[PDB]
Design a protein around this ligand. Sequence first.
Ligand SMILES: *[C@@H]1O[C@H](CO)[C@@H](O[C@@H]2O[C@H](CO)[C@@H](O)[C@H](O)[C@H]2NC(C)=O)[C@H](O)[C@H]1NC(C)=O
Ligand SMILES: *[C@@H]1O[C@H](CO)[C@@H](O[C@@H]2O[C@H](CO)[C@@H](O)[C@H](O)[C@H]2NC(C)=O)[C@H](O)[C@H]1NC(C)=O
Ligand SMILES: *[C@@H]1O[C@H](CO)[C@@H](O[C@@H]2O[C@H](CO)[C@@H](O)[C@H](O)[C@H]2NC(C)=O)[C@H](O)[C@H]1NC(C)=O
Ligand SMILES: *[C@@H]1O[C@H](CO)[C@@H](O[C@@H]2O[C@H](CO)[C@@H](O)[C@H](O)[C@H]2NC(C)=O)[C@H](O)[C@H]1NC(C)=O
Ligand SMILES: *[C@@H]1O[C@H](CO)[C@@H](O[C@@H]2O[C@H](CO)[C@@H](O)[C@H](O)[C@H]2NC(C)=O)[C@H](O)[C@H]1NC(C)=O
Ligand SMILES: *[C@@H]1O[C@H](CO)[C@@H](O)[C@H](O)[C@H]1NC(C)=O
Ligand SMILES: *[C@@H]1O[C@H](CO)[C@@H](O)[C@H](O)[C@H]1NC(C)=O
Ligand SMILES: *[C@@H]1O[C@H](CO)[C@@H](O)[C@H](O)[C@H]1NC(C)=O
Ligand SMILES: *[C@@H]1O[C@H](CO)[C@@H](O)[C@H](O)[C@H]1NC(C)=O
Ligand SMILES: *[C@@H]1O[C@H](CO)[C@@H](O)[C@H](O)[C@H]1NC(C)=O
Ligand SMILES: *[C@@H]1O[C@H](CO)[C@@H](O)[C@H](O)[C@H]1NC(C)=O
Ligand SMILES: *[C@@H]1O[C@H](CO)[C@@H](O)[C@H](O)[C@H]1NC(C)=O
Ligand SMILES: *[C@@H]1O[C@H](CO)[C@@H](O)[C@H](O)[C@H]1NC(C)=O
Ligand SMILES: *[C@@H]1O[C@H](CO)[C@@H](O)[C@H](O)[C@H]1NC(C)=O
Ligand SMILES: *[C@@H]1O[C@H](CO)[C@@H](O)[C@H](O)[C@H]1NC(C)=O
Ligand SMILES: *[C@@H]1O[C@H](CO)[C@@H](O)[C@H](O)[C@H]1NC(C)=O
Lengths: 428, 268, 146, 321, 49, 49
Amino acid sequence: TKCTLKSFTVEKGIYQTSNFRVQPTESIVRFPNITNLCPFDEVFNATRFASVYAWNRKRISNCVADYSVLYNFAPFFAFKCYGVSPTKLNDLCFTNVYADSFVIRGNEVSQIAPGQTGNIADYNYKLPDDFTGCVIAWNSNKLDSKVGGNYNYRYRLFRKSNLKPFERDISTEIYQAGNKPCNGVAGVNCYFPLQSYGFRPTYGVGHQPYRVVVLSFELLHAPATVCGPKKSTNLVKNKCVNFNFNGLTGTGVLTESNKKFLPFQQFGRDIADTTDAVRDPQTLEILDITPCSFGGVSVITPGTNTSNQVAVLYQGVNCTEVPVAIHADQLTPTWRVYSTGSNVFQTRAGCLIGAEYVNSSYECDIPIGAGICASYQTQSQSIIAYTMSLGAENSVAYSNNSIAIPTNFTISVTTEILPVSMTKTSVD
Amino acid sequence: TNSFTRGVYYPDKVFRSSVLHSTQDLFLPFFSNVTWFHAISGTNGTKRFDNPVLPFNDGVYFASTEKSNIIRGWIFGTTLDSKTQSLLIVNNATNVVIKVCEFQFCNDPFLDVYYHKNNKSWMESEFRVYSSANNCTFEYVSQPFLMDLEGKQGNFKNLREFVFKNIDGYFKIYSKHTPINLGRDLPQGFSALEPLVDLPIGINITRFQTLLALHRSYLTPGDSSSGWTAGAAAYYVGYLQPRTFLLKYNENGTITDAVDCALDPLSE
Amino acid sequence: SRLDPPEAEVQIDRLITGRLQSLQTYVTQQLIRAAEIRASANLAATKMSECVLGQSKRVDFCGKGYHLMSFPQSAPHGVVFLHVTYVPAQEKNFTTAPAICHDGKAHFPREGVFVSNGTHWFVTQRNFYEPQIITTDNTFVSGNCD
Amino acid sequence: CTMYICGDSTECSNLLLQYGSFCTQLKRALTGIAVEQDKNTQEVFAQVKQIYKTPPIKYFGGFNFSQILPDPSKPSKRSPIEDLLFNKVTLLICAQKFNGLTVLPPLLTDEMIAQYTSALLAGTITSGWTFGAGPALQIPFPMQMAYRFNGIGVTQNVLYENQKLIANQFNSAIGKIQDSLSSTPSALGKLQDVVNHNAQALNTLVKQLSSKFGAISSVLNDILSRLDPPEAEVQIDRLITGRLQSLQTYVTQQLIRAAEIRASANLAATKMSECVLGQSKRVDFCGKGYHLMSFPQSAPHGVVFLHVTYVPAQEKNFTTA
Amino acid sequence: CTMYICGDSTECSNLLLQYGSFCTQLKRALTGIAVEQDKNTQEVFAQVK
Amino acid sequence: SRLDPPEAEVQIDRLITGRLQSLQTYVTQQLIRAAEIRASANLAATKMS
Ligand SMILES: *[C@@H]1O[C@H](CO)[C@@H](O[C@@H]2O[C@H](CO)[C@@H](O)[C@H](O)[C@H]2NC(C)=O)[C@H](O)[C@H]1NC(C)=O
Ligand SMILES: *[C@@H]1O[C@H](CO)[C@@H](O[C@@H]2O[C@H](CO)[C@@H](O)[C@H](O)[C@H]2NC(C)=O)[C@H](O)[C@H]1NC(C)=O
Ligand SMILES: *[C@@H]1O[C@H](CO)[C@@H](O[C@@H]2O[C@H](CO)[C@@H](O)[C@H](O)[C@H]2NC(C)=O)[C@H](O)[C@H]1NC(C)=O
Ligand SMILES: *[C@@H]1O[C@H](CO)[C@@H](O[C@@H]2O[C@H](CO)[C@@H](O)[C@H](O)[C@H]2NC(C)=O)[C@H](O)[C@H]1NC(C)=O
Ligand SMILES: *[C@@H]1O[C@H](CO)[C@@H](O[C@@H]2O[C@H](CO)[C@@H](O)[C@H](O)[C@H]2NC(C)=O)[C@H](O)[C@H]1NC(C)=O
Ligand SMILES: *[C@@H]1O[C@H](CO)[C@@H](O)[C@H](O)[C@H]1NC(C)=O
Ligand SMILES: *[C@@H]1O[C@H](CO)[C@@H](O)[C@H](O)[C@H]1NC(C)=O
Ligand SMILES: *[C@@H]1O[C@H](CO)[C@@H](O)[C@H](O)[C@H]1NC(C)=O
Ligand SMILES: *[C@@H]1O[C@H](CO)[C@@H](O)[C@H](O)[C@H]1NC(C)=O
Ligand SMILES: *[C@@H]1O[C@H](CO)[C@@H](O)[C@H](O)[C@H]1NC(C)=O
Ligand SMILES: *[C@@H]1O[C@H](CO)[C@@H](O)[C@H](O)[C@H]1NC(C)=O
Ligand SMILES: *[C@@H]1O[C@H](CO)[C@@H](O)[C@H](O)[C@H]1NC(C)=O
Ligand SMILES: *[C@@H]1O[C@H](CO)[C@@H](O)[C@H](O)[C@H]1NC(C)=O
Ligand SMILES: *[C@@H]1O[C@H](CO)[C@@H](O)[C@H](O)[C@H]1NC(C)=O
Ligand SMILES: *[C@@H]1O[C@H](CO)[C@@H](O)[C@H](O)[C@H]1NC(C)=O
Ligand SMILES: *[C@@H]1O[C@H](CO)[C@@H](O)[C@H](O)[C@H]1NC(C)=O
C-alpha cells in the first residue's frame, strides 16, 4: 500500500493495490496424431524446378514439416519472410502451405518483395499487399547453367494486361506493335512477347540464376495439418495450464464442455474476443477453456500512525476454495503467509482476511461493501469487521390525542464548508 | 419464383451461441427472383438437351428437387473445353468425383430407342463424362453428399440446396438437404447451410452448366413462354451479391434468423 | 544530438503524441473538475443570497433545524458558513384535541394547538410551550361542534 | 490495465509501464467515482440520526398507508410499492469479469436502504416535519394534515369538516399509483436508463478488443507466438494505443455521466430535505399544484417520490370588489 | 465519420471500420446531446398543458 | 493517386488517428458544454416554475 501510494505514512482507509491471480500448474501441447514427414523436403533435393510462365502450386498435404530439417540441409540466401517469424516455425500449426517452384535472374532475386512492379510483377507473378509468407533460396548457378546461355529460363515478358495476383495462364498471343493484325505471324509492327535470359556460369552473382521457393500460406479455420513432431501431452479437466491447442497460445482452466458443437464446428467463442470453447485434436473432445479464477485485492489499514496490522480483502471470490487452498508458488504476488490468516469472514464482495467479525454493530469508518465495515479497536487492539450500524434505534408513541410540544430550545451554531474557486493554471 | 428467405449459410467456421454477429461476406439477397431453366430432357429421336450455360455471377445458389438421383453434377470454367481446367463434379451412386482435369467434351448418356421407359427401369449406361487428358489436376473423391429420406403417402420433398462461391481463388461448396413438404416453389421458413467442401484451385470461372440424367422420363413437362409463371420446377439458380448480412444464432448454436442490411430501411 | 535528423522525427512524433495526449487528458480533467466547482460555487452563492442575505424557510438548507442567521467567512479556495439554527429541547407530551365545543359550536385555534395539562385546556404556539387561557380572540368558529 | 490492456503477458506489461502513469490516473479517476456513488446515497437517505418504528396499531386517522409501509410478512422488508419498483427494473455478466472489468457492490445494501426509507416514513407520519429539526415530537396525523393545509392558504377547519372524504381521496389516489406504474411501460424510464447506459458502456468496452488497430490480429497471444520478438512491439504498441485510448474514453465518459448523476443526486437530497422532511412553499418543486407532503420510496439505483399535492377543482366565479 | 474522416474513399473507409466502434460511440454521444436540447426546451417552456 | 497502395496506409493510419482524435475531442468538449447548459436549463426551469 505504501508503495503504490508512494509514501511511508498511509492514512486510515481501504486501498486497491493489485490483483490475485493463480498460476498454471503444468503445460499441455495437443496435436493431431498424424506426423507423417512432409514431402516438400524433396523439393530441396530437386535440381530442375520450373520455367516461369505456367507456375505450379505444390500444395503440401497433411503431414509434418520439420522446418529444422530443411534448415539442416544447406544455408539459405534470401530467407526474407515478411510474415510469420522464420525462427519459431515449430510450435505453431499451419492449415496449408503452397510453396511454388520458381527461378529468376540474380539481379532480380533481391526483388522478391511485392513492391518491385515491372517485368517480374506485371508479367511473371504479382504478390498481393495483404499477404503473409516467406521466401527462401540457395545457390543454383553452377548446378544449372549453359555456356552459350540458358534458354530454358524463358518466361512471359509481355501479356495482354497487368497480371493479377494468384492467376495462372499462358499468354499465347502476339503483341500488336502497330497497324497489323497479329492473329497472323509477322515481324514488323507485330512482335511476339517473349524473353530468355541466357545465363552463363562465368559471371558475377548479379547475373547468376537463383532457385527461389516462395512460401505461401494462411492461418485458417481448417484443422491443423503441418506443425511438426512436437510431443502431444496429457489432458487435465480441473487445473489451469498453458495450453497450446493447434498453435492457439493461451492459458486458463480447461474443463469438459457441454456446449453442442455441430459435427463440423471446431472453435467456440462467447460474446467476446477470446476463444471460449475448443475442440481437442485427439479423441474429438470438446473443451470449455475458461480463465483461471482471479480477483482484485484491497488492503484495509488503520494507518501507520496508529498500528501496523492490516486486513486484506480478496474482491469477488468464494475464498473458501481458491485462496485458502494455495500450493507452493501458486501465485506470483506470494506473501502466502496469509493462506489461512487469522480469521476469515465471507462477504458479498469477497471474504476478509485478518479481521474477526463481531456480533455488535457500530458506526463504521472504513467501508468495504455490502453493508460491512471495518475498524481498529479493542475486542488488546485488533481489526474488526462488524456490520455497520444504521443508527440508534428509536420509537415515538404515536397516539390519537397525544401532542409533544418543546418547552425549551438550544441556539446551535453549525458549520458548512464549500469550495468556491480552484487555483488557476495556464500551460504552454 | 422469388428467393424469399433461403440462401443463408454459416459465414465462418467458428461456433457462437446467442450472438448477433454481423457479416460482410457474399450472400444471396433476400426477396430476389431466381431463374428456373425447366428442362424436358425427353431423350427422343434426335436431341433433347435443355441445360444452357450460366454466367456464374460471383457464386451460384443452386436449389433442386427430385425423387432419388435426377441431378448429377455441375460444370465450371470459361472455355468449357480442355483448353482450361473444368471444375467438373459427379454425384456418383455412392461416391463423389470432384475433378478439375481438362476434358475435350463431356460425354452424355446414349439417346436410346424410342421405347424409352416402357419397362426399362434398370440403371446402367451412364454418361462417363471423364474425357482422358494427359494433364490432370487431382480429384477429391469423398463421401457422397446425397442422402435421401424415404417419404410415404406423398407430402415429402427432399430439397437439395447448395452454394458455390469463389473468393480469392478458393472455391467453396456449402450444402444442405431439407426433407420438408413444399406447396410452392422456394417454400417459406429458414434453414442455414453448413460448409462442406473447400477447393484450393485458382482459375477463371465465368460460365456454369448443370448435369442432369433423365434417360427415364419421370413427370417432366415443358413450356415455351418466358416470364414470371408458376408450376413444377426441376431446379433454381440464383446469383450471390456482396451484402452485409446480420445473423442471429440459438442457445444450441443453430442460426435461427438473419436480416439483410441493404434491402429495407427497417432492416437497416 | 545522438540520432540523425532525417529519421529522428519518427521517434519525436511518437514521443510528441504521448506527451501531447498526456496534456490533453489534464485539460479535460480540469474541465470536469471546474464544472464540479461551478456547481459548488453557485450553491455557495445561492446559500449566501438566502442564508446570509436573509432568512430561509427551506428545511435543512442553511443548517440542521430551524435556520435563523448565517455568517460568511473567507477561506482559501472557498467559503465557510456559520449557520445559526434554532433547535427545540426539553420537550413534554400533553393531551390534545382538534377543536373545542362550548355552546354547541366548534372552536378552532387561530394559531397553535389545543393542549390540556390534565385539568384546564390551553392553546399554545407550536415550537414553544407558552400556554394561554382560551378566549374568543384566540379562536374562531366554523359550524356546530357535531 | 494489467488485465484489460495486456493479456497477463510479461512482454506486453513491460510496454505498459513504458507509457508511464496513464493507468494510475485511470484507476484513481474510477476510484473517485466509486467513493462518490457511496457518498451520493448518504445525502439522499442518511438524513436521520435515529431509526424509527411505526406503532403496532396503525389507525392513522382514516388514512391508509399499507402501500408504503414495509410488510413484515415478506422476507424482504419492503413496501408493496417498493416491491413493484424492484421487479420492473431488470438489472453477459460473466464475460466481463474475465477481461479485468469488475463491478463493486454498493456500501449500503438494498435492504439497509429500505430501513432508512421506513425510518423517514415513520418520522413524517407520526412526528411530522419536527424530526428533521431536532427531537421527534408526538403529533396525531389528522392534526398533522391540518397544519399542512395551514401552510398552503386554507384554514384548518377545512380538513376536519371533510376528514372522511379526504382520507377516501388519499386512499383511492395512492391505490392508483400501484396500477399507474404497471400500465405505463416507460414509467421508470429514468431509472432503467441508468442501468442501461452502464451495461452498454461495459459491453462496448469489451467489444473494443476486436479492433485490430493496425496490427495483424486482435488476439495478443497470436503475435507473441507467430511474430518474432525484436519487431513485434511496433504492432503491439500500435495495438496498445487504440486499446488504451478506448479505455481512456470510457473513463472520461463516466466522469460526465457521474457528474450528471451528482446533479440528480443532490436534487434528490434537496427534494428529500424539503418535500419529505417538511412542507415546501416553492411552486412545482414537489409536484404539480400546492404541495402538502411527500413520501420517499427506495428504488434500484435511485429514489422514487410520492408527492401528495392539493389541487383545486369544481370552481365558480363571482363578482368581487 | 464516413464523411469527415474519409473523403468517401473505399480505401479509407475499410481502415476506419478496422478501428472498431470509435464512431458508433461519437454518433451515439452526439445523438444524446441532440435529444437533450429538445428536452431542455420542454421543461423551460412546456409547463402549461 | 500519388503514393502506392501497399504502404499508403502507413501514412493514412497516421492521418486517420489525428483526424479521429480531433473529432473525439470535439465530441468530449460538447459533453461538458452540454452539461453546463443543462445546469442552466434546469435553473431556467426552476425560475419559470
Ligand atoms: C411521554 O413521553 C415520555 C418520555 O418523553 C414517554 O415515556 C417513555 O417514552 C419512550 C419513547 O420512546 C418509550 O420508549 C418508553 O417506553 C416510555 N416510558 C414510559 C414509562 O412510558 C411517555 O410514554 C410519553 N407518554 C405519552 C402519553 O405520550
Ligand atoms: C384511536 O382511534 C381508533 C378509532 O378512532 C380507536 O379504535 C380502533 O380503530 C382501529 C381501526 O378502526 C381498530 O383496528 C381498533 O381495533 C380500534 N380499537 C378499539 C379498542 O376498538 C382506537 O382504539 C384509538 N386508540 C386508542 C389507544 O384508544
Ligand atoms: C433551558 O435551557 C437552558 C440552557 O440550555 C437552561 O439554562 C440552564 O439553567 C441551569 C439551572 O440553574 C443552569 O445551571 C445552567 O447554567 C443554565 N444554562 C445556561 C447556558 O445558562 C434552562 O434552565 C432551561 N430551562 C428549562 C425550563 O428547561
Ligand atoms: C437443443 O437440442 C436438444 C436436443 O439435442 C433439445 O433438448 C430436447 O428438447 C425437447 C423439447 O421439448 C425435449 O422434449 C427433449 O426431451 C430434450 N432432449 C434433451 C436430451 O435435452 C433442446 O430443447 C434444444 N434447445 C433449444 C431448442 O433451445
Ligand atoms: C389499506 O389498503 C389495502 C389495499 O392494499 C387494504 O387491503 C385490502 O383489504 C381488503 C379487505 O380485507 C381485501 O379485500 C383486499 O384484497 C386488500 N387489498 C390488497 C391485499 O391489496 C387494507 O385493508 C386497507 N387498510 C384498512 C385498514 O382497511
Ligand atoms: C481471368 O480473366 C480476366 C478478365 O476476364 C483476365 O484479366 C485474367 O488474366 C484471367 N486470368 C487467367 C488466369 O486467365
Ligand atoms: C489419436 O490418438 C488418440 C489417443 O487416445 C486416439 O483416441 C484417437 O482415436 C487417435 N486418432 C486417430 C485418427 O488415430
Ligand atoms: C498522528 O496524527 C496526529 C493528528 O491526526 C498528528 O498530530 C501526529 O503527528 C501523527 N503522528 C504521526 C507519527 O504521524
Ligand atoms: C462457495 O464454496 C462453498 C464450499 O465451501 C460452497 O458450498 C458454496 O456453494 C460456494 N458458493 C458459491 C456462490 O460459489
Ligand atoms: C452474537 O452471537 C453470539 C453467539 O451466537 C452471542 O454470544 C452474542 O451475544 C451475540 N451478540 C449480539 C449482539 O447479538
Ligand atoms: C427477375 O427479375 C428481374 C427484375 O425484377 C427481371 O428483369 C427478370 O426477367 C426476372 N427473371 C425471372 C426468371 O423471373
Ligand atoms: C419424347 O419425349 C418428350 C418428353 O419426354 C416429348 O416432348 C416428345 O414429344 C417425345 N418424342 C416424340 C416423338 O413424341
Ligand atoms: C463411382 O462408383 C463406381 C462403383 O460404385 C466406381 O467404380 C467409380 O470409380 C466411382 N466413380 C468415382 C468418380 O468415384
Ligand atoms: C415389359 O413390358 C411388359 C408389357 O406387357 C411387361 O409384362 C413386362 O413385365 C415388362 N418387363 C419388365 C422386366 O418389367
Ligand atoms: C499439357 O502438357 C503438355 C506440357 O507441355 C502440353 O501438351 C501442354 O502445354 C499442356 N496443356 C496445357 C498446359 O493446357
Ligand atoms: C394545569 O394548569 C392549571 C393552571 O391554573 C393548574 O391550576 C393545574 O393544577 C394544572 N394541572 C396539574 C395536574 O398540575
